[PDB]
Amino acid sequence: PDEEGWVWGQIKAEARRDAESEPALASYLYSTILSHSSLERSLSFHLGNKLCSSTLLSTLLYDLFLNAFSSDPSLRSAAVADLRAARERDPACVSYSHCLLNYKGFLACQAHRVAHLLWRQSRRPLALALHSRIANVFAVDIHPAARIGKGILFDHATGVVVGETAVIGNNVSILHHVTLGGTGKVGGDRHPKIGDGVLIGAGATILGNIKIGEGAKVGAGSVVLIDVPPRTTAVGNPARLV
């Protein structure tokens, strides 16, 4: 009945249709989704399997993710907001279950939120180990110390880089090959601050500690080295306001 409850209900219904139509995937859909009663448990199960390695057991990571989601209401809210963001804004128009299972941006983002929590809980070696796996597996390189809001859309997430001192607001869309990073300058605050509702086009590079205002749009291929005011469009190399 509630928002999360309804979304989870949709995920199960969709998974059940997919399991019935594709016997090669039926058991995996059962073990990941249909055998569970919550989004948190299914997401944790899936992330544990996706990110496991010889260093990190899938059952260990499953525990880690599940504990984090069960302990932290804001992580659950963020996951549902990000599922909604994909359902609403994804150009390829995703079902909830396909986003949950297959969307690398979405999955990397939820896993990053747990890495960020570890980082804040003074478990930085583990935060960094998790970060390394997320990069390995989802081609998403978001430093655990980066701050990101919710309702985030990560389209063709491969090669996304978000630096250590970056800040990303709510309802931001980050397309393919976006770099939110630095000049090569050593130390300190050196990564961009991205306002709510910003759209960053494919291949855009945004460098230095500059501001990208609320609702602004960055055109594809742009190299943005200056502050972009709210509700404006910046495009070009170097980027200029349009």
Next chain:
Amino acid sequence: PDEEGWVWGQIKAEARRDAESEPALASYLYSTILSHSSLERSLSFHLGNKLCSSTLLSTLLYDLFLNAFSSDPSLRSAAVADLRAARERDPACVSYSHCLLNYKGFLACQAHRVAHLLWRQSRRPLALALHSRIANVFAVDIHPAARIGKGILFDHATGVVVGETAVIGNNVSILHHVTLGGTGKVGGDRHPKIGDGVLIGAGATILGNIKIGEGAKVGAGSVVLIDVPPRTTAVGNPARLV
């Protein structure tokens, strides 16, 4: 004696020389190539091993690929054409066996052709699962619904993105970090149409449903937002005709 037969003959001879010279690779070359009597079986064997996961057994994928190649003459023709394309046009000048075994663009492309067939056979969940693995393993993100011709050259394929509604003709070369994608606009026909014999330079971004004419060339780093006429060169950000 036939074209495929001769190419396969070359692959075996080359593999045999490599197996004799490198004992660390001899068994793998035997199991993948020398123990088989066809290109289809060896390619299926190799793709099954490359793309397997805890979700998808290598023997299952081996069956899937082998069935597709045995059922679909055009898939076999495309694989041989793509092997020829690499042999003829690859700047690094590849042998047939090294292309078959090591070239990520070539392998991802053949696997994509099978994903495209599944998509057309109304096995879309499996098409998408296969697509996800191809992206995972070969750093090639071609949506199963994309249409691609044959004789395709994928140089430094890592980070290649080809969107859902893209169309690529025959004898096209797609270099490193090319994006054939969209603006962020939701739904519908939103990805480029690439004519026969087009060369797309490294890091080029081509967005929207625009036309890239036969024989055209796109310079490296270009952001192409307009139609490019046949036999012309477009370069720049934004791209202009030269």
Next chain:
Amino acid sequence: PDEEGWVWGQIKAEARRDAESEPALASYLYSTILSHSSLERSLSFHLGNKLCSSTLLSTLLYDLFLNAFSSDPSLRSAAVADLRAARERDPACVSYSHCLLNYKGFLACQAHRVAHLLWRQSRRPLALALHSRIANVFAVDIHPAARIGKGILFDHATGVVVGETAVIGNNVSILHHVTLGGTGKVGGDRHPKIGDGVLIGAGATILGNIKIGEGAKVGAGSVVLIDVPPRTTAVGNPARLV
């Protein structure tokens, strides 16, 4: 007491602190670092685990790397120089142990040096197999025939491409998504020559056999198609001297 000895001493001390603070990582830190008495053995152990596959046993790769480091004093010097380069120049300010364990650029680079040695020892099939794994695992595509110096910094190494005929001097910094590659022209010397102490900014593309002079800087997003004189800055698409 010696330089390598001191750096290795720091690595062990750091690993020991991390193992004490994070029980999830303690055994892995013990098996990789604390149970060994040299940087070479620990790096070989780690690279063997990172790069192993169904084709290549971790114990085989461990042997391969260890033999190379034990046989080749210049490989050991290069590894220490690259550790120093990260410690000194990395904007994210890395500890030695975190660089050794987690930095993909550093690890891919050391593994590449061994691939380059194999290539020179007429073990090219194995050099290429190793190269393929390095690309797979570290998202670093450096052809085994490429020549690179030491003191190299590879920031956000994902999607780095260095072509077959490229030459990179000492104390070079190569940031995210740099391409040192070619036009699409087939055969011959077709990749850039990078002087000592050059800084190449994020997303820069440098194509053709051109010269990038000592101490030069290439701005982010640049497409460099001409020779850059020493101690100068090139920026733009196409790049111009500033």
